[PDB]
């Protein structure tokens, strides 16, 4: 009946009532070939009663196997049954590394829901999350790299060390188990350990270099010259000439070192560094090296933006997004991929507007407002894409210093210090959209505006379809040391859930999205 289809449609986090539980339970045998009924059914099971547990796992066997997207729910805190947890890993094994990599950050966090004793006893349908992740890491260099940096930061975490010494020791063990597996492997596998160790030394030497620059009082010019001098002496610092190691930030990129003479410090409180990595093929890879600050909140947000971009691209909707790489190398430092762009604040300061800026660096006679057709389409798509993504992620503290623009027309957001409905000012707008963006398209009477609205609807409807995956991924982050999560862990997933408005139809959703843009665009006139 229809009452069953309304119950299975529920978000992964929607808590079923006792009345709703005993209903799914009664009709369990009639739901066995319904893929999206299994999670709802496993919720209903009295995992304490042996006869119920027994019949439930019998049903788990004969049940239509679930999607990887839905399987992520089985790895959360709500599940403790070892069979249900091995089943979750068994479905997760069906995913390819490309997908697995998209979920890895949350999978490292999901280890704190695993059996700590099994992880320990492994030192010196049958695989747990630890064995599975190490297994996959041994076969894929990229995966091994992120499993290393994700676990090392959780080991380093001093807040976990004191608050949960049990979880801290579990991660030390995950690292020991990983190191053990690497040494028991093939020629290819055994060299991954020395590669991870070489990058760890590299980062340690870079951390020391940043400190060597700050030991003094000096002009930014003098500090820049102190950075350049220290990077130049490869005999002492060994940072300008290294055996081609993976770049922790993007391991597919193999680096020779940092170019000494082009390295500088940013005009910013913690003076992060701009460093150019010499890649194996003579190319340059610019990075931001941030010290004395925690990148984990940005690292999560950029990981979700990347996922959202891949999902949209999958549905043949490339909205020209900039999911720049963010990697924390400690709870105190890390890397960000430097993107050549200009903050919108500076766009207004130097050129007066986004339109002027575009007319200057990308003109064309009969193009929209004398601007390149390609640059304008890129701008409309990226605006729409970010308007929707920042709306869902509840990104606050939006100002024109953390809104960046490229000369190719790419608009994007940076610095995700405020997320999930948090903002320095009270009553913040739900739709993160300003008059500078709107004026960039050519105002509300422009064909570009209608196109922007259209792209906002398309993105929303496609992202709404992946609500199960996104909410499951957030549910694995509830107990992570992410400031804006740690504030209200118990309320985190619902904050994301409510933005999808999964209560509304596709037609109803586009009207709500349509009204939200209007209510925001008319609020810009007060
Ligand atoms: C580091 C922080 C004080 O915590 C703020 N957070 C943050 N987050 C991301 C970026 C970033 C990321 C990627 N590309 C660029 N490019 C550009 C291109 C041109 N002018 C600016 C940025 N900037 C940045 C900006 C760099 C530090 C100056 N800051
Ligand atoms: Na990008």
Curated annotation (Swiss-Prot):
**Keywords in UniProt for this one?**
ATP-binding, Autophagy, Cell cycle, Cell division, Cytoplasmic vesicle, Endosome, Kinase, Lipid metabolism, Manganese, Nucleotide-binding, Phosphoprotein, Transferase, Ubl conjugation
Cofactor(s) for this UniProt protein: Mn(2+)
Residues of the region (G-loop) are: 265-271
Enzyme kind, highest EC tier: transferase
Could you tell me which cysteines form disulfide bridges? none
Q: In which tissues is it expressed?
A: Ubiquitously expressed, with a highest expression in skeletal muscle.
- Biological processes per GO annotation: autophagosome assembly; autophagosome maturation; autophagy; cell division; cellular response to glucose starvation; early endosome to late endosome transport; endocytosis; endosome organization
Q: Where in the cell is it found?
A: Midbody; Late endosome; Cytoplasmic vesicle, Autophagosome
After translation, the protein is modified as follows: Ubiquitinated via 'Lys-29'- and 'Lys-48'-linked ubiquitination by UBE3C, promoting its degradation. Deubiquitination by ZRANB1/TRABID promotes its stabilization, leading to autophagosome maturation.
Q: Where is this region: Catalytic loop?
A: 394-402
Give the CC-aspect GO terms.
autolysosome; autophagosome; axoneme; cytoplasm; cytosol; endosome; GABA-ergic synapse; glutamatergic synapse
EC annotation from Swiss-Prot or TrEMBL: 2.7.1.137
User: In terms of domain of life, where is this protein from?
Assistant: Eukaryota
List, for all copies, the residue spans of the domain called PI3K/PI4K catalytic: 259-525
Recorded catalytic reaction(s): these are: a 1,2-diacyl-sn-glycero-3-phospho-(1D-myo-inositol) + ATP = a 1,2-diacyl-sn-glycero-3-phospho-(1D-myo-inositol-3-phosphate) + ADP + H(+)
Cell division listed as a keyword: yes
Quick one: signal sequence residues?
none
The entry lists its GO molecular-function terms as: 1-phosphatidylinositol-3-kinase activity; ATP binding; phosphatidylinositol kinase activity; protein kinase activity
> Looking at the record, which segments are called Activation loop?
413-434
Domain PIK helical: residue ranges: 1-174
Record bears the keyword Transport: no
What family does this belong to? Answer: Belongs to the PI3/PI4-kinase family.
Relate the assembly described in the record.
Component of the PI3K (PI3KC3/PI3K-III/class III phosphatidylinositol 3-kinase) complex the core of which is composed of the catalytic subunit PIK3C3, the regulatory subunit PIK3R4 and BECN1 associating with additional regulatory/auxiliary subunits to form alternative complex forms. Alternative complex forms containing a fourth regulatory subunit in a mutually exclusive manner are: the PI3K complex I (PI3KC3-C1) containing ATG14, and the PI3K complex II (PI3KC3-C2) containing UVRAG.
Its annotated function is as follows: Catalytic subunit of the PI3K complex that mediates formation of phosphatidylinositol 3-phosphate; different complex forms are believed to play a role in multiple membrane trafficking pathways: PI3KC3-C1 is involved in initiation of autophagosomes and PI3KC3-C2 in maturation of autophagosomes and endocytosis. As part of PI3KC3-C1, promotes endoplasmic reticulum membrane curvature formation prior to vesicle budding. Involved in regulation of degradative endocytic trafficking and required for the abscission step in cytokinesis, probably in the context of PI3KC3-C2.
What's this protein's name? Phosphatidylinositol 3-kinase catalytic subunit type 3
């Amino acid at each position: 009946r229809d009452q069953l289809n309304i119950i299975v449609s529920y978000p992964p986090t929607k808590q079923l009532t006792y009345e709703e539980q005993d209903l799914v339970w009664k009709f369990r045998y009639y739901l066995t070939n319904q893929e999206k009924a299994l999670t709802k059914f496993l919720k209903c099971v009295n995992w304490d009663l042996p006869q119920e547990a027994k019949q439930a796992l019998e049903l788990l066997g004969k049940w239509k196997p679930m999607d990887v997207e839905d399987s992520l729910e089985l790895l959360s805190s709500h599940y403790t049954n070892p069979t249900v947890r091995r089943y979750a890993v068994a479905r997760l094994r069906q995913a390819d590394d490309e997908d697995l990599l998209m979920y890895l950050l949350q999978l490292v966090q999901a280890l704190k829901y695993e059996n700590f004793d099994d992880i320990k006893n492994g030192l010196e349908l049958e695989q747990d999350l630890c064995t599975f992740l190490i297994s996959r890491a041994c076969k894929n260099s990229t995966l091994a790299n992120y499993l290393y940096w994700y676990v090392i930061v959780e080991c380093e975490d001093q807040d976990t060390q004191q608050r949960d010494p049990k979880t801290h020791e579990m991660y030390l063990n995950v690292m020991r188990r990983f190191s053990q597996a690497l040494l028991k492997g093939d020629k290819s596998v055994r060299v991954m350990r020395s590669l991870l160790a070489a990058q760890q030394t590299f980062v340690d030497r870079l951390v020391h270099l940043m400190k060597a620059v700050q030991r003094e009082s000096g002009n930014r010019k003098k500090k820049n010259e102190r950075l350049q001098a220290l990077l130049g002496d490869n005999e002492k610092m060994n940072l300008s000439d290294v055996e081609l190691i993976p770049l922790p930030l993007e391991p597919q990129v193999k680096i020779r070192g940092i170019i000494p003479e082009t390295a500088t410090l940013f005009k910013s409180a913690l003076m992060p560094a701009q460093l150019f990595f010499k890649t194996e093929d003579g190319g340059k890879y610019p990075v931001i090296f941030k010290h004395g600050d925690d990148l984990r909140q940005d690292q999560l947000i950029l990981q979700i933006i990347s996922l959202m971009d891949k999902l949209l691209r999958k549905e043949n909707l490339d909205l020209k997004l900039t999911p720049y790489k963010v990697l924390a190398t400690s709870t105190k430092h890390g890397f960000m991929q430097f993107i050549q762009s200009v903050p919108v604040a500076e766009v207004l300061d130097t050129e007066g507007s986004i339109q002027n800026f575009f007319r200057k660096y990308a003109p064309s006679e009969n193009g929209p407002n004398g601007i390149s057709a390609e640059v304008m389409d890129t701008y409309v798509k990226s605006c729409a894409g970010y308007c929707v993504i920042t709306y869902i992620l509840g990104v606050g503290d939006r100002h024109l210093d953390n809104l960046l623009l490229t000369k190719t027309g790419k608009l994007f957001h940076i610095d995700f210090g405020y997320i999930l409905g948090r903002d320095p000012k009270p009553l913040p707008p739900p739709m993160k959209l300003n008059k500078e963006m709107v004026e960039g398209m050519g105002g509300t009477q422009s064909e570009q505006y209608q196109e922007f609205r259209k792209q906002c609807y398309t993105a929303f409807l496609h992202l709404r379809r992946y609500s199960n995956l996104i909410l499951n991924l957030f549910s694995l982050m509830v107990d992570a040391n992410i400031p804006d999560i740690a504030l209200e862990p118990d309320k985190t997933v619902k904050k994301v859930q409510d933005k999808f408005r999964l209560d509304l139809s596709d037609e109803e959703a586009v009207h709500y999205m349509q009204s939200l843009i209007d209510e925001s665009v008319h609020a810009l006139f007060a």
